[PDB]
Write a protein that holds these residues in place. Structure first.
Motif, PDB file in Angstrom:
ATOM      1  N   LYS A   1       0.827  -1.201   0.000  1.00 26.64           N
ATOM      2  CA  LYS A   1       0.000   0.000   0.000  1.00 26.64           C
ATOM      3  C   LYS A   1       0.865   1.256   0.000  1.00 26.64           C
ATOM      4  N   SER A   2       0.595   2.155  -0.942  1.00 19.58           N
ATOM      5  CA  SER A   2       1.350   3.398  -1.051  1.00 19.58           C
ATOM      6  C   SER A   2       1.382   4.134   0.285  1.00 19.58           C
ATOM      7  N   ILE A   3       2.369   5.007   0.448  1.00 17.39           N
ATOM      8  CA  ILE A   3       2.512   5.778   1.678  1.00 17.39           C
ATOM      9  C   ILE A   3       1.761   7.101   1.589  1.00 17.39           C
ATOM     10  N   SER A   4       1.808   7.724   0.416  1.00 16.92           N
ATOM     11  CA  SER A   4       1.134   8.999   0.199  1.00 16.92           C
ATOM     12  C   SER A   4      -0.147   8.806  -0.608  1.00 16.92           C
ATOM     13  N   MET A   5      -0.141   7.805  -1.482  1.00 15.18           N
ATOM     14  CA  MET A   5      -1.302   7.513  -2.315  1.00 15.18           C
ATOM     15  C   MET A   5      -2.366   6.762  -1.521  1.00 15.18           C
ATOM     16  N   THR A   6      -1.950   6.137  -0.425  1.00 14.92           N
ATOM     17  CA  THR A   6      -2.867   5.383   0.421  1.00 14.92           C
ATOM     18  C   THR A   6      -2.681   5.742   1.890  1.00 14.92           C
ATOM     19  N   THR A   7      -3.745   5.585   2.673  1.00 15.60           N
ATOM     20  CA  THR A   7      -3.700   5.893   4.095  1.00 15.60           C
ATOM     21  C   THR A   7      -3.501   4.630   4.926  1.00 15.60           C
ATOM     22  N   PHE A   8      -3.382   4.804   6.238  1.00 13.38           N
ATOM     23  CA  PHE A   8      -3.186   3.677   7.143  1.00 13.38           C
ATOM     24  C   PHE A   8      -3.798   3.966   8.511  1.00 13.38           C
ATOM     25  N   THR A   9      -4.025   2.910   9.287  1.00 18.61           N
ATOM     26  CA  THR A   9      -4.608   3.048  10.615  1.00 18.61           C
ATOM     27  C   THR A   9      -3.603   2.671  11.697  1.00 18.61           C
ATOM     28  N   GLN A  10      -3.936   2.989  12.944  1.00 22.29           N
ATOM     29  CA  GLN A  10      -3.061   2.684  14.070  1.00 22.29           C
ATOM     30  C   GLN A  10      -2.656   1.213  14.061  1.00 22.29           C
ATOM     31  N   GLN A  11      -3.644   0.331  14.171  1.00 22.82           N
ATOM     32  CA  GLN A  11      -3.388  -1.104  14.175  1.00 22.82           C
ATOM     33  C   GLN A  11      -2.335  -1.474  13.136  1.00 22.82           C
ATOM     34  N   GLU A  12      -2.308  -0.727  12.037  1.00 23.49           N
ATOM     35  CA  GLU A  12      -1.349  -0.977  10.968  1.00 23.49           C
ATOM     36  C   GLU A  12      -0.002  -0.333  11.282  1.00 23.49           C
ATOM     37  N   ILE A  13      -0.023   0.967  11.553  1.00 29.35           N
ATOM     38  CA  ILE A  13       1.196   1.701  11.870  1.00 29.35           C
ATOM     39  C   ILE A  13       2.037   0.951  12.896  1.00 29.35           C
ATOM     40  N   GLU A  14       1.448   0.684  14.058  1.00 30.17           N
ATOM     41  CA  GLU A  14       2.144  -0.028  15.122  1.00 30.17           C
ATOM     42  C   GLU A  14       2.745  -1.331  14.602  1.00 30.17           C
ATOM     43  N   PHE A  15       1.976  -2.046  13.788  1.00 34.28           N
ATOM     44  CA  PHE A  15       2.431  -3.311  13.223  1.00 34.28           C
ATOM     45  C   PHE A  15       3.692  -3.112  12.388  1.00 34.28           C
ATOM     46  N   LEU A  16       3.717  -2.033  11.612  1.00 40.09           N
ATOM     47  CA  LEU A  16       4.863  -1.727  10.764  1.00 40.09           C
ATOM     48  C   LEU A  16       6.020  -1.174  11.590  1.00 40.09           C
ATOM     49  N   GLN A  17       5.687  -0.436  12.644  1.00 35.24           N
ATOM     50  CA  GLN A  17       6.699   0.149  13.516  1.00 35.24           C
ATOM     51  C   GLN A  17       7.406  -0.930  14.331  1.00 35.24           C
ATOM     52  N   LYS A  18       6.632  -1.884  14.838  1.00 34.75           N
ATOM     53  CA  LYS A  18       7.182  -2.973  15.635  1.00 34.75           C
ATOM     54  C   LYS A  18       8.022  -3.909  14.770  1.00 34.75           C
ATOM     55  N   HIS A  19       7.868  -3.790  13.456  1.00 37.19           N
ATOM     56  CA  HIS A  19       8.614  -4.624  12.520  1.00 37.19           C
ATOM     57  C   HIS A  19       9.715  -3.820  11.834  1.00 37.19           C
ATOM     58  N   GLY A  20       9.323  -2.981  10.881  1.00 34.23           N
ATOM     59  CA  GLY A  20      10.288  -2.168  10.164  1.00 34.23           C
ATOM     60  C   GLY A  20      11.380  -3.000   9.519  1.00 34.23           C
ATOM     61  N   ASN A  21      12.089  -2.404   8.566  1.00 32.55           N
ATOM     62  CA  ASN A  21      13.166  -3.098   7.868  1.00 32.55           C
ATOM     63  C   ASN A  21      14.322  -3.401   8.815  1.00 32.55           C
ATOM     64  N   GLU A  22      14.344  -2.714   9.954  1.00 33.81           N
ATOM     65  CA  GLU A  22      15.395  -2.910  10.944  1.00 33.81           C
ATOM     66  C   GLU A  22      15.621  -4.395  11.211  1.00 33.81           C
ATOM     67  N   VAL A  23      14.625  -5.041  11.810  1.00 30.47           N
ATOM     68  CA  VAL A  23      14.715  -6.462  12.121  1.00 30.47           C
ATOM     69  C   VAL A  23      14.262  -7.313  10.940  1.00 30.47           C
ATOM     70  N   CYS A  24      13.141  -6.932  10.338  1.00 34.51           N
ATOM     71  CA  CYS A  24      12.601  -7.660   9.195  1.00 34.51           C
ATOM     72  C   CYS A  24      13.720  -8.140   8.278  1.00 34.51           C
ATOM     73  N   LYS A  25      14.396  -7.196   7.634  1.00 33.13           N
ATOM     74  CA  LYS A  25      15.490  -7.520   6.726  1.00 33.13           C
ATOM     75  C   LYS A  25      16.386  -8.603   7.320  1.00 33.13           C
ATOM     76  N   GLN A  26      17.050  -8.277   8.423  1.00 34.61           N
ATOM     77  CA  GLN A  26      17.938  -9.223   9.089  1.00 34.61           C
ATOM     78  C   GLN A  26      17.287 -10.597   9.197  1.00 34.61           C
ATOM     79  N   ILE A  27      16.021 -10.617   9.602  1.00 34.08           N
ATOM     80  CA  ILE A  27      15.284 -11.867   9.745  1.00 34.08           C
ATOM     81  C   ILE A  27      15.210 -12.617   8.420  1.00 34.08           C
TER      82      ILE A  27
END
Ligand SMILES: [Zn+2]
Length: 134
Positions: free
Chosen positions: A60-86
């Motif tokens: 889902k686009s960042i500017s072309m599409t919106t997001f909700t809390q439940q989503e934001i937190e999910f992406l924040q708790k993940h992020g490429n930081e650990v995701c990638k490494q994983i």
């Protein structure tokens, strides 16, 4: 109080991180998409590619599409930081190299071995130690 944008405020912070400045595949400096499945920050180019895979991921686009809390937190708790490494658990600059970020065929064939084949797929559940060592 204060007003400006709900949720978005938390987003601009995610894609802002130094580990997100670049895409997840093409490593392009300037991500404009986010994978709801992998929980990473991709671009318009990749976003479309991922879909081609099977099963088709969720982008889902960042500017072309919106997001909700439940989503934001999910992406924040993940992020490429650990995701990638994983996803690069086995990946090793020496073991293998990185393809080019100009051709889709190259980025695709590679992205597949990461998801379609899940070669360097190493989840944390096991990576780390716990009360249950399967
Ligand atoms: Zn990309």
């Amino acid at each position: 109080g204060s007003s400006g944008s709900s949720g978005l405020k938390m987003l601009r912070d995610m894609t802002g991180l130094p580990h997100n400045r670049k895409c997840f595949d093409c490593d392009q400096r300037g991500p404009t998409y986010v994978n709801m499945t992998v929980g990473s920050f991709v671009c318009t180019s990749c976003s479309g590619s991922l879909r081609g895979l099977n099963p088709p991921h969720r982008v889902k686009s960042i500017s072309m599409t919106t997001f909700t809390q439940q989503e934001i937190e999910f992406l924040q708790k993940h992020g490429n930081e650990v995701c990638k490494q994983i996803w690069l658990g086995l990946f090793d600059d020496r073991s293998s190299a990185i393809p080019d970020f100009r051709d889709p065929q190259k980025v695709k064939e590679f992205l597949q071995e990461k998801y379609e084949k899940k070669r360097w797929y190493v989840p944390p559940e096991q990576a780390k130690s716990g009360p249950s060592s399967g």
